[PDB]
Subunit: 175 residues, 6 copies
């Protein structure tokens, strides 16, 4: 029972996808779905006193250029628990490379929080909030000798194209 | 692996049942067991700044008039995590309709918290605490245009009859 | 010393005011400044499982129609501690009556959280969030038999005029 | 100003007293009012992984056999912040000796939490909860080599007589 | 899907084992893996206001003298969620009997928290921290009439011998 | 009264100093004592999702090259509340420049937490923890366009000399 393989990418792809959350906002512990058992695993404790600024996880049945499930960041007011599924509306995409392939990350809002009803595109997000997320990813591995370049942000349409591409990559890899 | 179908309704039905908790007390996020995978899912974020006043979930292998597993509310001092099983003693039952069928909810205490040892019936609960729970359910969907009528509270015996009825409903539906 | 009397209403009244916080967002306990002494006092525990949706306090050296210091609600991502001073930009005002008294409340954002840099008027707030604040005040005293009437929301300009009026009422009262 | 000296012992002594809280329920840090100044001070960190089971503080303008202000324990569902004033109804008293000193402690409920409306005497408290409070004081200083003797619990009447006695000791000491 | 049987004892036994956490540090609720379904279950609420001083759980595919999976205590700065796997370096072992067979417990640190990089043996732990853990286990069931004798602490080498013995016990019992 | 002016620098200067805490570990809100009044004020919300890695405050009756009270960082397992006094043993000093000003900060442990009994100098601190504190100050104002230079860490002896120097600067400034 590995929810990464068992759940479909979403109920109305790519307008609404499922986000399987691994890390709640506010966590300094970096969790991930164990590849084998699908249990939650501690990947590492961040080397710096930083916390995930968003609920962070993966879209089920996706694969990406970086050889991982496609990352998704969901803006939740109250963080969820790890392994919670959220119906999420993609509104943009963070463009970054940590190495050699794209490690881009979808930015999304919960469909079922009315607070975010008018958040439909990247332009709807407060600039300082985008800058805080980009900064987190730019620096959170700095003490691990890792450097990352944030290229910028793409819009909702680009996010949705990339989601479809990641769904196709998963089908091509696993069938 | 869906714990709703896999776990028995309880170790000594209906004097002690299992409560599979979906929502810890204090949550504004309304979680539920995903029908298909049995993973935790965000159903919605409550539209108002209210929090679940009890640990809330379902009794495994039950079905009810409203076409859902039978709801159970467990009074915990320290909330549990979602998907935690609690051995629970039914002490009463909240009578309400949100629509057209009974959406009644068992009120229970943890067998293994000695704080609640003398809580055996509805009359053992502070009146204001019952009124706070009823009020939560009366108003928590008010901004979703939903109206609910709380009829009142039934006693431990009535709660136990309803649990047995819900166990029979599940057997009749699924076998 | 009593901070309600010792602090000025703000550093750039009424464009920027001091909010002296009594109740952090997420509190079910209703604290209030004892103007006998400067000390935080538990006014009551809310009768329902509701939490303050905003950091809630008073503007120093103000008074109001309801015989209290003028209320201010500050939108904070991370709640502050009681008795914390926040430099706040008024962006609107909630118009409500409590138990027959005009009991309006300023809505404001923290000047020094860049997240809110572009919140400058009431139209900048998500409608669902305004609705949730109003609903809270509509229902939080319902089990206490008290009645509130929410009239609606005024804009930043009206909030600022009310601030000036409340500043004069303090002079009228104590001066 | 020093709130231990500036506040009265209560608004309706000894039926209702002020509890000036030093330690919120759930704290492992042992705070205490610095009666040099009014300020909260870290007295120590408990040597064991135990937490205060009650909101713990002092009654203003009291003194006691052990050379401290008279201790009061308030049963709060949601803990208050340190230095919060609570209007408290004494319902009993814990009789204990600390390091050879009479060090009894009032047990009280908040007047303004309707949850506790019918708690008026020591027989209203769950026995397991009384046991847990006593056990905490029995063992919390064990790694510090200190010995405590818990004698038992007295009723509301005895608590109130002790409150009056402690009020007179303050006059004897400072008056 | 029972993670106790499904996961291997560790990636580099016995230098690095997997710790499947049942109870996060700070919990008063005592959780355990349900024997049958492998869901988290509330075993009991501790009878005293004590909290687990470490993240507590089991090593997968182990069995011990006491007829349970072998216990492991992991020192985490930020507690994990129940059912999280942690790669853990054994540094010592708490020797205790609660009854008649050894109920010894491995003490470990997370490999992937650099804070603990130089914690490799029992001598690396602050004495007061060992004393706090031993005290917790000595007293936490005191109100349940249970008495426990803490014998002392063994070193990293002894911990590793015992882990290997527990791995062999599991193979002998289940195959 | 203003605790920065009313409290002495410590009970056994400079071996033991008072730390007046402004910011609890784990805070993203940057609080500071308003030396206009004694009151806690929100200075800003950090622009990045970082949290203070230490309990952060000032030493009473000190002043410094940067025109502020001398900064002190206290390593607390459980964070204290703002405005809490902690008796602290200096063990080292972080040497850094903020915006062109010498802005060094004492590192200290609480005298009354036995966990830290053997932390008496800078070599007693895990290197990763020193690195995480420095990194925090290296990057926490990066989105604010401010530059900091971390020089390194000095030992307990140097910290204590700096404390004496800062005590004299307060006399120079106010005396
Ligand atoms: Mn990726
Ligand atoms: Mn139902
Ligand atoms: Mn008002
Ligand atoms: Mn005493
Ligand atoms: Mn064992
Ligand atoms: Mn400085």
């Amino acid at each position: 029972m590995n929810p990464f393989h068992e759940l479909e990418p979403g109920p109305e792809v790519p307008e609404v996808v499922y986000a399987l959350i691994e890390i709640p906002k506010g966590s300094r512990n970096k969790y991930e779905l164990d590849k084998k058992t699908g249990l939650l695993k501690l990947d590492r404790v961040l080397y710096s006193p930083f916390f995930y600024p968003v609920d962070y996880g993966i879209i089920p049945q996706t694969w990406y250029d970086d050889g991982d499930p496609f990352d998704i960041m969901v803006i939740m007011r109250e963080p969820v628990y790890p392994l919670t599924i959220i119906e999420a509306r993609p509104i943009g995409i963070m463009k970054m490379e940590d190495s050699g392939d794209k490690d881009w990350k979808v930015l999304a809002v919960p469909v079922e929080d009315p607070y975010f009803n008018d958040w439909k595109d990247i332009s709807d997000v407060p600039k300082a909030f985008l800058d805080e997320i980009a900064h987190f990813f730019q620096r959170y591995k700095e003490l691990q000798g890792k450097t990352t370049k944030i290229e910028g942000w793409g819009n909702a349409e680009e996010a949705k194209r990339e989601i479809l591409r990641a769904i196709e990559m998963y089908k091509e890899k696993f069938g």
